Amino acid sequence: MEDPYIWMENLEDERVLKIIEEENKRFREFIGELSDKLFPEVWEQFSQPTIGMARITKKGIIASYSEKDRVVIKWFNGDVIVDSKELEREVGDEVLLQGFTTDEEGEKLAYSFSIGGADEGITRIIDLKTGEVIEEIKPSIWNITFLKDGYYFTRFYRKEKTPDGVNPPAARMFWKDREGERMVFGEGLTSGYFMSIRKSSDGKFAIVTLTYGWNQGEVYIGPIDNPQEWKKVYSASVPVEAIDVVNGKLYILTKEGKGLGKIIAIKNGKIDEVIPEGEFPLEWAVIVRDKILAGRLVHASYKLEVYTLNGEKIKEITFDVPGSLYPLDKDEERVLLRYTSFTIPYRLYEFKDDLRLIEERKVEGEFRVEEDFATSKDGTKVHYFIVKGERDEKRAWVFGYGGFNIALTPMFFPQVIPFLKRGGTFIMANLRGGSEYGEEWHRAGMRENKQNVFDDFIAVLEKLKKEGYKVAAWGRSNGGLLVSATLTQRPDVMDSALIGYPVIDMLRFHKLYIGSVWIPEYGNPEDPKDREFLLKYSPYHNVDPKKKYPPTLIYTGLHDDRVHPAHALKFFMKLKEIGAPVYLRVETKSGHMGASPETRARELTDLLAFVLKTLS
Numbered sequence: 001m002e003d004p005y006i007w008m009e010n011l012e013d014e015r016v017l018k019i020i021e022e023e024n025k026r027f028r029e030f031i032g033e034l035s036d037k038l039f040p041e042v043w044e045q046f047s048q049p050t051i052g053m054a055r056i057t058k059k060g061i062i063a064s065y066s067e068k069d070r071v072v073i074k075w076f077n078g079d080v081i082v083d084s085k086e087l088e089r090e091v092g093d094e095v096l097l098q099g100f101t102t103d104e105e106g107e108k109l110a111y112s113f114s115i116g117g118a119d120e121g122i123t124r125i126i127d128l129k130t131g132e133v134i135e136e137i138k139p140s141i142w143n144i145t146f147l148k149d150g151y152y153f154t155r156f157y158r159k160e161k162t163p164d165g166v167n168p169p170a171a172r173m174f175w176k177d178r179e180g181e182r183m184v185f186g187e188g189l190t191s192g193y194f195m196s197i198r199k200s201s202d203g204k205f206a207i208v209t210l211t212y213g214w215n216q217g218e219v220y221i222g223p224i225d226n227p228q229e230w231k232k233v234y235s236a237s238v239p240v241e242a243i244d245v246v247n248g249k250l251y252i253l254t255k256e257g258k259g260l261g262k263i264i265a266i267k268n269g270k271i272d273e274v275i276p277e278g279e280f281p282l283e284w285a286v287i288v289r290d291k292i293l294a295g296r297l298v299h300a301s302y303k304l305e306v307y308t309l310n311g312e313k314i315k316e317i318t319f320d321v322p323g324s325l326y327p328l329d330k331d332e333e334r335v336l337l338r339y340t341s342f343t344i345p346y347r348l349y350e351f352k353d354d355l356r357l358i359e360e361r362k363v364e365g366e367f368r369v370e371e372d373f374a375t376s377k378d379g380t381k382v383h384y385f386i387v388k389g390e391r392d393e394k395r396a397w398v399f400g401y402g403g404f405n406i407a408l409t410p411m412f413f414p415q416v417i418p419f420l421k422r423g424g425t426f427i428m429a430n431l432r433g434g435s436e437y438g439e440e441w442h443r444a445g446m447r448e449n450k451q452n453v454f455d456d457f458i459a460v461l462e463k464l465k466k467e468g469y470k471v472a473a474w475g476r477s478n479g480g481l482l483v484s485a486t487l488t489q490r491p492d493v494m495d496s497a498l499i500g501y502p503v504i505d506m507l508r509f510h511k512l513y514i515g516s517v518w519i520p521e522y523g524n525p526e527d528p529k530d531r532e533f534l535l536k537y538s539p540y541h542n543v544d545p546k547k548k549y550p551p552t553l554i555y556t557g558l559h560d561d562r563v564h565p566a567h568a569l570k571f572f573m574k575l576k577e578i579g580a581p582v583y584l585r586v587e588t589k590s591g592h593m594g595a596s597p598e599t600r601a602r603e604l605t606d607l608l609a610f611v612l613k614t615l616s
C-alpha cells in the first residue's frame with residue numbers, strides 16, 4: 001500500500017532533517033519568549049526532591065531521590081551511598097539511574113544505570129559498609145535476589161539471541177555465585193515470555209511468575225536454593241501476580257473471572273477463593289504479619305483494605321486527597337508505600353499493623369481536587385478528576401490516555417502547577433481501554449472498540465465546553481493517538497490540541513520499532529477485517545479539509561526508541577496540507593528525564609507555554 005510520506009520513516013533522509021530544523025525554529029520563535037519566562041516556575045516544581053524507589057533492610061530504609069540535576073541513593077535520613085554526580089565524574093559522562101535493590105541484611109546493594117543515555121546499561125553491586133564495588137555487570141541485569149553467597153537475576157534480551165538460541169525479545173533467569181553463573185530457568189521459552197522471581201516472606205521459597213502478553217500466566221514455586229525442585233503450581237489464561245507462600249499456601253492476585261481482581265490460594269493443587277471479586281478493581285495485594293493489605297481502586301483513586309489471611313475484612317483506610325498508592329518493598333514486618341497526587345509529589349507511608357506517614361512533599365496552596373462524570377455516546381459514565389486553584393479563568397487542560405490496561409490515577413504534573421496559579425483547571429479523564437474498571441474496561445477500548453475511547457474523551461471535552469471552558473486537549477503516545485483522532489473527528493470540542501509522541505499511521509504502526517507489540521490492542525493492519533475498523537479513525541487517513549482546526553502542537557523526540565517519530569512527522573504533513581494551525585517540536589538532545597531534568601523540564605515548559613498562548 002503506497003504511502004506518500006514513507007520516506008519520513010528514514011530519519012536520516014535530508015528532507016526529514018530539513019523539516020525538523022525548520023519547524024523547531026518556527027516553534028521556538030512562537031513560544032520561546034513565554035517559555036523562557038515560565039521556565040523558572042516550571043523548573044521549581046519539576047526539580048524538587050522526589051522519592052523513587054525504597055527498600056527495607058535490617059539496618060534501615062534505603063531510598064532513591066531526584067533533586068534538580070542529581071539523583072541519589074541514600075540511607076533514609078542518613079548517608080548518601082550513591083550520587084549520580086559522583087558517578088558522572090568517575091565515568092566522565094551523563095548517567096541515568098534506573099533502579100536498585102539490596103539484601104535483607106542491608107550489607108549488599110545493587111544499582112543499575114546507563115552511561116550517557118546509552119540504550120545499554122550497567123549494574124554494580126557494592127558493599128554498603130565500605131562502598132567497594134564488588135561487581136560490575138554489563139549489560140544491566142534485573143530482579144536481583146540475594147541468597148547465601150550469590151543471587152538470582154534475570155536478563156532481558158533485546159538485540160541478542162538468548163544463550164539457548166531463542167530470538168528476542170526474551171528473558172532468562174540465572175544464578176550467580178563465586179563458582180560462576182548458570183541459567184536456572186527459561187530454557188526453550190519462545191520469544192514473548194517474561195519472568196520474574198521473588199522470595200516468600202519467610203525467605204524459604206522461590207516464587208517464579210511467567211507471563212506471555214495478556215493471555216497466559218504461570219506460577220512456579222519451590223525451595224529458594226533449589227531450582228531443580230521448582231514446580232509449576234498454577235496456570236492461567238491471563239497474567240497473574242503471585243503474592244506470597246505462607247504455611248504451605250500460595251496466594252495469588254488474579255484478574256480471572258469478571259476481570260476486577262480477586263485473591264485465591266492454592267494448597268496441594270486445590271484452589272480456594274480468599275477474597276472474591278468486588279465492585280471495584282483490586283490492583284495489588286501484599287501479605288504482612290498475618291494480614292492481607294490490599295489496594296482497591298475506587299473510581300481511579302486508591303483506598304486501603306486490610307484483611308485476615310482468611311479474607312475477612314478488618315479495616316479500611318481512605319485518604320484526605322484522592323491519590324495513587326503503590327507498594328515499594330516489604331519484609332516480614334512492614335510494607336513501604338508510595339503515595340502521589342496532583343498537588344502531592346509524594347508521601348512515604350509505612351504499614352505494619354496500621355498506616356504511618358514517614359515523609360511528605362506537597363505543593364503549598366489552596367488547591368481543590370474534585371471529581372465528576374461525563375456521559376458518553378453509549379451511556380458509559382466517564383469519571384474525571386478536576387484540579388483547581390483559588391482562581392478560575394475558565395481554562396481547562398484536559399489529559400487522557402485510554403488504552404493498554406493502564407488506569408490514569410492521581411499523579412504530580414509539575415508544569416500544571418503554574419497553570420493552576422494562573423486560573424487554570426486541570427482535568428484527568430478515565431477513559432475506556434484503561435484498567436479503571438477491570439479487564440472488561442480495557443477490552444471495551446481495544447480493536448473495534450477503540451472508537452469508544454475517543455467517544456469517552458469527546459464526552460468530557462464537550463461537557464467542559466458547554467460549561468464555558470476554553471479547552472486544551474493533551475495526551476502522549478497512545479494518548480497522542482487519542483488527541484489526534486479526536487482532533488480529526490471533533491475539532492469543535494477543543495480550543496487547543498497537544499499531541500505527544502503519537503501513534504498516527506494505523507496501517508503501518510506495526511512496521512516501526514516496537515509497534516508490532518501493540519497489535520493485540522489496536523488490531524492487525526495486514527488483515528482487511530481489522531483495516532475496516534482501523535481506517536474509520538486512523539488520523540493519517542481521516543484529515544478533513546472541510547473542518548476548521550484549532551492550534552495544534554505535535555511533539556516527539558528524534559531519538560525515541562519506542563514510538564517512531566515518523567508518526568508525528570506524517571500527521572504534521574497532513575495538517576500542513578490543509579493549512580491547519582499546526583506546530584511541530586522535535587526534541588534533539590539525547591536520553592530521557594530520570595537524571596537529565598533540564599531538557600525534560602523545558603519540554604514541559606514548552607507545553608505550558610503553548611496552552612497559555614493558544615487559549616488566549
Ligand SMILES: [Cl-]
Pocket residue numbers: 476500
Ligand atoms: Cl509529555
Ligand SMILES: [Cl-]
Pocket residue numbers: 557592593600603
Ligand atoms: Cl520526554
